[PDB]
């Protein structure tokens, strides 16, 4: 209780989507996308008519709404560009210039897709993953074939390292009354896949003390038969001159009343070298990227948070919950080291954080 009033985080509510004319039935994974902190896109069928709604997070009181039919709609992370699909037909549309950009017809249905950069869409079929540039004439390019361990899964995420050399596909399945995560880590250079049991993950770049060059880290969290675990590992050849990053493995805690909770989302602060982990029940956890030390845990949402993105300005995490609350969490930069000193009583981490300068 000493200094218990000083949190290491700042929680913020940004929006309530039901106050912006969004039907609650459409606030969910199949109909609402948030590919970055810049936009939220919702598909709604008002009467017999399919509509696409775009909320510009910089102008949220003026949603853009159009009678456009699509099975899925994802805004570009940065520009006023949208990808739409209808069956096997994909199109990318330049909203700003009110013009079509690119189109492609697949032979296999796309069951999941996501923007992975300012200019590339990843496409997941039942049997493969493709990357499609929004520029130029190029067709999607196959990156890898799907591993059998993901067969029949609901795909929930796809993401890459910054250099697009380490690719990660995540799915879940219902095995009796358990939700089991299955990941496929693919190395572009080695042309090798590794199946991993995991629920949520991210990549990060991290410059170790004593090294001149960044390490590419892969962090994943799982709740399996052994309970909750978080792993932080370097992937790929360490830059010449670097020492290797020692792999970290730490517990992920669930209270006794939360036996059916599990990880659903992860984002990593570039600036603060902190991992944000969100659970199905609406808990957030913070871990130190370097050591895996658990900094903080709390239940921040009464409803499941079903989509997240980096929150750029604060190097935090932003998300939408099933009632339509748009919320974020970030490090509170002036309070985190007091909290580490006096509540965690971890002066090694207090020092290491100040030395990084944060
Ligand atoms: O009615 C329209 N209203 C618009 N306004 S907008 O550009 O600000 C805008 C705004 C929001 C959008 C959301 C999703 C997809 C496109 C959008 C475009 S463009 C248009 C028709 C149109 C124009 C050019 C070529 C074809 C057109 O028809 C379709 C376009 C995409 C999918 C299906 C049909």
- Residues 358 and 355: their CA atoms lie apart, in Å, by 8
DSSP H helices in the chain: 336-339, 347-356
Q: What atom in ligand 1 is closest to the CA of residue 99?
A: 24
Whether the Cβ atoms of residue 105 and residue 89 lie closer than 8 Å to each other: yes
Which of the 8 DSSP states describes residue 137? S
3-class DSSP assignment, residue 291: coil
**Using DSSP, how many helices (H) and how many strands (E) does the chain show?**
2, 28
8 Å CB contact between 206 and 245:
yes
DSSP annotation of 260 reads T
In which residue are the tokens 């939408």 written? 320
Using alpha carbons, select from 6, 3, 4 the residue that is nearest to residue 333. Answer: 6
Closest to 31 measured CA to CA, from 11, 51, 5 = 51
- Residue 72 structure tokens: 């899925």
Resolution for this experimental structure (Å): 1.4
CA–centroid distance, 29 to ligand 1, in Å, is 23
Tell me which DSSP letter residue 77 carries: S
DSSP string computed for 185-220: EEETTTTEEEEE--SEEEEEEE--TT-SS-EEEEEE
Vertex 354 angle, CA 349 and 356, to 5° = 95
The answer to whether the CB of 318 falls within 8 A of the CB of 327 is yes
Q: Enumerate the β-bridge partners of residue 331.
A: 9
What is the Rg, in whole angstroms, of the alpha carbon atoms belonging to the chain?
A: 20
Please report the atom of ligand 1 found closest to the CA of residue 69: 33
17-22 long-range contacts, CB within 8 A, separation 24+? 17/42, 17/55, 17/320, 17/324, 17/325, 17/326, 18/323, 18/324, 20/55, 20/60, 20/61, 20/63, 21/63, 22/53, 22/324
Going by C-beta distance under 8 Å and a sequence separation of 6 or more, which residues neighbour residue 13?
325, 326, 327
Q: Can you list the domains of the chain with their CATH numbers?
A: 2-358 (2.130.10.110)
Nearest C-alpha neighbor of 172 from the set 187, 194, 157, 193: 157
- Method used for this model? X-ray
Beta-strand relationship, 81-86 and 72-75: antiparallel
Displacement of CA 285 from its chain's centroid (Å):
14
- DSSP secondary-structure letter at 244? P
- Find, among 124, 118, 119, 195, the residue nearest to 156 by Cα: 124
The residue among 231, 201, 236, 198 whose CA lies nearest residue 216 is 236
Residues 230/220, Cβ–Cβ less than 8 Å: yes
In the reported structure, the alpha carbon of residue 66 is separated from the centroid of ligand 1 by a whole-number distance in angstroms of 7
Mutate to test the pocket of ligand 1, among 49, 64, 68 (most ligand atoms within 8 A of CB): 68
CA distances from 248 to 194, 200, 234, 268, 356 (A): 19, 16, 10, 16, 19
CB within 6 Å of ligand 1 — which residues?
A: 52, 54, 64, 66, 68, 82, 84, 93, 95, 98, 100
**What backbone phi and psi angles, to 5 degrees, belong to 354?**
-70, -35
Residues contacting residue 348 through CB under 8 Å, at least 6 positions apart: none
CA–CA gap between residue 18 and residue 38 (Å, rounded) = 18
């Amino acid at each position: 209780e000493f200094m218990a009033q000083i949190l290491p985080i700042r929680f913020q509510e940004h929006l309530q989507l039901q106050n912006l004319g969004i039907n609650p039935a459409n606030i969910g994974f199949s109909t609402l996308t948030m590919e970055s902190d810049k936009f939220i896109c919702i598909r709604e069928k008002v009467g017999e008519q399919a509509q696409v709604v775009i909320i510009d997070m910089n102008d949220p009181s003026n949603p853009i709404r159009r009678p456009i039919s699509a099975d899925s709609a994802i805004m570009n992370p940065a520009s006023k560009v949208i990808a739409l699909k209808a069956g096997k037909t994909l199109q990318i549309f330049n909203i700003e210039m009110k013009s079509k950009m690119k189109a492609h017809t697949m032979t296999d249905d796309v069951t999941f897709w996501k923007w992975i950069s300012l200019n590339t869409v990843a496409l997941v079929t039942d049997n493969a993953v493709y990357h499609w540039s929004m520029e130029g004439e190029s067709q999607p390019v196959k990156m890898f074939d799907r591993h059998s361990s993901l067969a029949g899964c609901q795909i929930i995420n796809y993401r890459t390292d910054a250099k697009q050399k380490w690719l990660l596909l995540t799915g879940i399945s219902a095995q009796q009354n358990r939700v089991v995560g299955a990941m496929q880590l693919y190395s572009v250079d080695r042309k090798v896949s590794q199946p991993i049991e995991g629920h949520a993950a991210s990549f990060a770049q991290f410059k170790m003390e004593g090294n001149a060059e960044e390490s590419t880290l892969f962090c994943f969290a799982v709740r399996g038969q052994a309970g909750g675990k978080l792993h932080i590992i370097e992937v790929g050849t360490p830059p010449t001159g670097n020492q290797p990053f020692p792999k970290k493995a730490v517990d992920v805690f669930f209270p006794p009343e939360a036996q059916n909770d599990f990880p659903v989302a992860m984002q990593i602060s570039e600036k603060h070298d902190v991992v944000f982990l969100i659970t199905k029940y609406g808990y957030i956890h913070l871990y130190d990227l370097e050591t895996g030390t658990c900094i903080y845990m709390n239940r921040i949402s009464g409803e499941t948070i079903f989509v997240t993105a980096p929150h750029e300005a604060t190097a935090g995490i932003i998300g939408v919950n099933r009632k339509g609350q748009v919320l974020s969490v970030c490090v509170e930069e002036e309070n985190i080291i007091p909290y580490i000193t006096n509540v965690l009583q971890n002066p090694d981490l207090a020092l290491r954080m100040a030395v990084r300068n944060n």
